[PDB]
């Protein structure tokens, strides 16, 4: 149970394969509700993401503050992992406990490509967080003229 | 000089007595300690930021101080860590030989100028600057066996009543308290605060206003009105002194006139200043004191004073308070003193035995019994003059010098007995002739042995500091020994020895002794016969010599080296590490299981377990802990299986089953202030602003590469802590401004409630202490609790934190490291079996060179010394060889004859290497100094053989072969008597077990082996060396006698 | 060096007993010593005896009811009666200190305390007598 | 300025005293705090102590306690002086 | 005083011993020193 999580955090492939091959819960969650997919998306281990999804890892698992692997990957600029998660059924409009969506996070960092991918997959451009702010608002406040356009 | 004192034997006695008197006084007065200063001087700056995370500490405190650490002399490197307990330690390490007071003052001065740039919360905790490389003298524990006190109650008692009387005790210098004096704790309730529209800001304001000490002037104060008759101090508010007074602090007067008091929104109690560390002694609450020895202080005096002082205190302890002593280096040091005096006393006895065996009268056996103590006593006076202490190293230096001192006594006495027997001269006149045969050589030997032992003293760093202890001790004893041999022992020979009839060799004695004399006379003739036949074909034995030289080199490169042997010091350590995010309570259960194991499965060996929950050797934190295990006395732990090394391997095995933590037991190094010895100490460094995440990636890259060379690198691991989940909370500035909630009130509410805040001071039973506010625990545990805290807006409405903030999980560091002012990560490791640490180091550097651009590295600690101290060994021994040759050239008035002494060197070395190799020991510092003293003795034996032979040719006209054989005939007996006494006298050290036997075994084993092969081989090879050297470098008729 | 003659003894409160209990112990020792004039001569304390001092208690409730801040109260009392170093000025080219204090005739006697007024939040001036009380007690002019 | 003995002692004297450790060759320490608002803390060292080193070690420990003293005290200057040296002279200045 | 009272006897014991030893060397005799050393009280009584 726990060997999978730190294996996925470390980015140790064959280990992970041996652990589902030996029966490790792909949906095992640490104390803050992070799953191996959360950890792999966070640190950016694209191949691990594919292997856990190939093995039935909940693509929409959420941690104790409502955040999903897609949030992590959008936030930190892991474009290919965003694509993979989205092709495997990642909820493009999932909201964490703050109302924040992957589009908000990707917008906040300026990851133009992720924003376009999320939009192509149906990201609600008008979704508001708990403060009433949309990805457009974020782009204005940041001064990002390139992003402010696409939105 | 010898003739002067032969005629003045009382003057010679007076000189010897005054020497003994000076040494005895030096012994009564010198510092005694386990080790002298060996570690390079280090100064540590410590600061604290209550409630702060690692990054906050590092970027508001650590970097600020580091940027001002320049302009400081003799600095080798600087390292720092900043952690999640809100603590930073910055350690500056200086060259060996730096004056530690000057280094501390220069660091403090630079710190001082950076103090106004630190947060006031940090300044108000005190920023300390301490000498951190000094050794621990003892660890005192304080418990309450009545069970009536928390660790906070005990810590307060220690702080208020104990800790300063200890600091004032004779020889103490530096004391760490385990815990704190009491703080007044105000534990706030956010439900009650919100009910009255209050915040922690209002609480803090009221405490500062109503727990205050006011200066109010005087009635009739100066300058006064004319005719004033009254003068009195005005006494206005004074600090509060009790929980009851803090409870009635008036926060608010309601609309209906009712009163809101502090006790209506908070619980109020005396508590600790912080709660990050739980300390237990055999599972009971504990406080205590870590007590360091001041530089150059006497450890046995300080320890005994501390213990009598704490006894001065016991009558006044509250019921149940008990003092325990889990660590005290005093017992081990006294063991060491006792073992060395034992070795010395039994060496004296064995010299008496060999003296009487060979010379068969009690009169002659008295002279070495007098001379050796005189020299030993006197060496202490020389040490005093040079400022050394009595310590493990100086004391073993004396036992390693016993061979040389015994030899000066034997050589003087035996030669007079020989001259009397061979010439019937009376004692007085035989002593004058005999001193004439040997005193020039004795002075040459002193210069030669100086050349052997002095260059050691000029090694750098820590290992230079260790060798210097042996070098000055041995040279001083040897120098004093030659003085005594020119002043006192001749006088004693002349006045005490009884004449021997010419030609009388005791073969006409009865019983065992008559048999022995005929046996030994016969044996000597066989020896000279055998040497004479060896000299007929010298080429064959030269070939044998080369064989020996080659085998010595072979043995030398195959023998693993090391530093100092581990000892059973009666204590050892166990480390405890739980996963990321693990809590104090979970660590405590693991520590409770560790404690229980030692006190049941090792009930017979373990006296106590001192368990600290919250700090470890990888860093600090709720998921870290240490258990310090103190054993029963060595006497009650008989057998190998009951020694530290075996106990610790069982424990680690037993703790492999515990799955919720990593638990490892290990022995202390011999010199704990140094740690380490084994392995290497590598620093990976972010040199391009890459940031912490990219640094960790590089580190993980290096660690995986190293794992792909288990042939060379073993256990390459980071020294510190992995990233962990942290709770990132973002304040929405726009919403706060729309609601009229000031950011200051927000950040103070959050920090004071969740982190706690030092407000001001109060007076507790006459003593000034701190006041802290913080949330009661149950309102600051979980993210859900964040929204229970309210802040008052400008319009008076209370606004919950949930209205203007948001949160998410992320990863960050609980312990950020820096090296020479740049982010760093320390990596530990060692050479694989049968590999050099030097080549392992080379592999690390090669792996490291592949890492991404902007990542560099450095070596620190044990490895920095090596990387700056490898060119020394060849050039310092080259110096020794050259000066030895030159001293010999002067002694003999000859550029070639020195070679016939110098060739003896491998003869003793091969035996040392064999005994170490056969016994599975290492090339460590005790082995190395043994080598020099074995080599010293063998060279001295050769100097006197060659001196006798050359003087026979020069002053008596004898031919080469006849002079050579007569020389070794005369020298066989004194050579054998010294070697027999010395080999026997080292025997207890070779076989010793128990307290201190790591060192004893290491000094005894290579010396015994080398004495054997030096004795057996030299008596055949140096006649060969002299004959072949004289034949190769000559000119005209030396094989024939002349006039 | 001073001294030479005699002895120099320190009595020490080692249990949080407080100043009054320390003085009592001292007086006990001093009287005992006086009962051995055969051996001890002129055993006396080196320092000063307790003296009357004027204890003034600020009523926090009344100050809050009147809207008078404790900071203004303690600053008014301390600056007027004790004096206060404010900042520096330049006197003939040389930097020196600026002090405020009451003129002597308004800070001599307890009656003068009530002549000092503090401004409340609503702008009214409130005399010290409205929110304080006072009594005589004993304390030390020199604590060792 | 303006402080009574107890106020001096409990906001200044005790604070400094609690930081007077880690100082070499110290024989004893004594202090008085008085009604003129003055404190003197005297640290006496073994005969033969180098007085410059003792003053520097005392100052260094004082320095780290300075942020804990009232600003009114810091602003008067906290001095550290060798106090066992002898008087060479006393000069008086009058205006006749 | 309370830390310097054991000094006077042991330092004069040292003085006596070293004086004896210097005299023994000067005279080449363990006994003749006594005939000098006994003079000590003669001057001391007049001083007193
Ligand atoms: C690392 N070190 C010196 C140790 C070792 C063993 C210990 O058992 C302890 C320390 C630090 C000390 C410092 C003290 C400190 N002080 C003397 C009051 C202090 O308030 C702190 C701090 N570093 O913020 C503690 O954690 C502390 O309360 C504590 O619990 C300690 C403690 O228990």
Residue numbers in the entry:
A (entry chain D): 15 to 165
B (entry chain A): 1 to 1043
C (entry chain A): 674 to 817
D (entry chain A): 50 to 145
E (entry chain A): 866 to 913
Which sentences from the paper describe this structure?
Resistance nodulation and cell division (RND) efflux pumps are secondary active antiporters that are ubiquitous across all domains of life. As part of tripartite multidrug efflux systems in Gram-negative bacteria, they span the entire cell envelope and export a broad variety of structurally and chemically unrelated toxic substrates. During drug efflux, AcrB undergoes a functional rotation where each of the three protomers sequentially cycles through the conformational states loose (L), tight (T) and open (O). Substrates can enter the PD through several channels and bind to the access pocket (AP) in the L state and the deep binding pocket (DBP) in the T state.
To assess this, we solved the co-structures of V612F and V612W in complex with minocycline via X-ray crystallography. The introduced F or W side chain is sandwiched between the reoriented F615 and F610, forming a stack of aromatic rings, and closes off the groove of the DBP, thus reducing its size. Minocycline is shifted in the binding pocket to avoid steric overlap with the introduced F or W at position 612. Compared to the wildtype co-structure, the contact between R620 and minocycline is lost, but appears to be compensated by additional H-bonding interactions via carbonyl oxygen acceptors of Q125 and G179. Further, the flipped F615 is in interaction distance of the aromatic ring of minocycline. The V612 variant co-structures demonstrate the plasticity of the DBP that is able to accommodate the ligand and allows the formation of alternative interactions despite the alterations in the binding network. Corresponding to these results, the resistance against minocycline is only marginally affected by the V612 substitutions. In contrast to wildtype AcrB, that crystallises in the LLL and LTO states, the V612F/W crystal structures were exclusively obtained in the TTT state.
